Design a protein around this ligand. Structure first.
Ligand SMILES: CCOP(=O)(COc1ccc(C[C@H](NC(=O)O[C@H]2CO[C@H]3OCC[C@H]32)[C@H](O)CN(CC(C)C)S(=O)(=O)c2ccc3c(c2)OCO3)cc1)OCC
Lengths: 99, 99
C-alpha cells in the first residue's frame, strides 16, 4: 500500500507465531523488537541511537510477515521502547520512499 | 524520486545557508541535527530515543531545503548520532512509504 507520514507508520507484523505492532523505519539499519522469548541460538549485540546504546540478542534467519508480505532476516531482541522494522527487512518487502 | 532502501537514505539538505547530509527517517517524529550554529531564538527541549533522553535546542519555523524541496518547521539541534529528517518535515515535502 501507500502509507502517509502524518501519523507514526505502524503496521501489524507476525513473528514467532505472534502478532505485534511495529514501526516501518527507514532510519533503522536493523530490525529491533520488544523483549520476546524466541527459540534458537543468538548472539549479544549493542545498538545505538539517540540517548546511547541498548543490549540486544541477535537472531538470524527469522521469518516476519509484514502486512501480508514475508521477509526473512536478522532480528534484534531487547528492551526497545517500540518494535522497529529496519531496512534489512523493508528491502525484502520492496518498500520505497517516494516524494 | 523513488528511493530504495538497500543503502541508508542519505540526502543533501540546505539549512542556515549551509549544505549538510541527513538521513530520511520515518521512525522519527522530529528532525534532529548534530551541533551547529543556527540563527534565531531557540528554547531548551528534551527528546527521547532508543537509548534514553537527550537535551536539544528547539528552533521553530526554520527554512530547510531537502533535495531541493522546501520545508519550514521545527529543527532540534543536539547530540544525535546522525542528522535525521523526521516526519514533521517529511510530510511537508510529500514523502510516503510504498510497498
Ligand atoms: C515509547 C517511546 O519511547 P521514547 O519516546 C523513544 O521511542 C522511540 C521511537 C522511535 C525510534 C526509532 C528511531 N527514531 C528516533 O530516535 O526518533 C527520535 C527523533 O523523533 C522522535 O520521535 C521518536 C523518537 C525520537 C529511529 O527511527 C531509528 N534509530 C536510528 C536513528 C539513526 C536515530 S534507532 O531506533 O536509534 C536504531 C534502530 C535500529 C538499529 C540502530 C538504531 O542501529 C542499528 O539498528 C526509537 C525510540 O523514549 C524512550 C527513552
Amino acid at each position: 500500500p501507500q502509507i502517509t507520514l502524518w501519523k507514526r507508520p505502524l503496521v501489524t507484523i507476525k513473528i514467532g507465531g505472534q502478532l505485534k505492532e511495529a514501526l516501518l523505519d527507514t532510519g533503522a539499519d536493523d530490525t529491533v523488537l520488544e523483549e520476546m522469548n524466541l527459540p534458537g541460538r543468538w548472539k549479544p549485540k549493542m545498538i545505538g541511537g539517540i540517548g546511547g546504546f541498548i543490549k540486544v540478542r541477535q537472531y538470524d534467519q527469522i521469518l516476519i510477515e509484514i502486512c501480508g508480505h514475508k521477509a526473512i532476516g536478522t532480528v534484534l531482541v531487547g528492551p526497545t521502547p517500540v518494535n522497529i522494522i529496519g531496512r534489512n527487512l523493508l528491502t525484502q518487502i520492496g518498500c520505497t520512499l517516494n516524494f
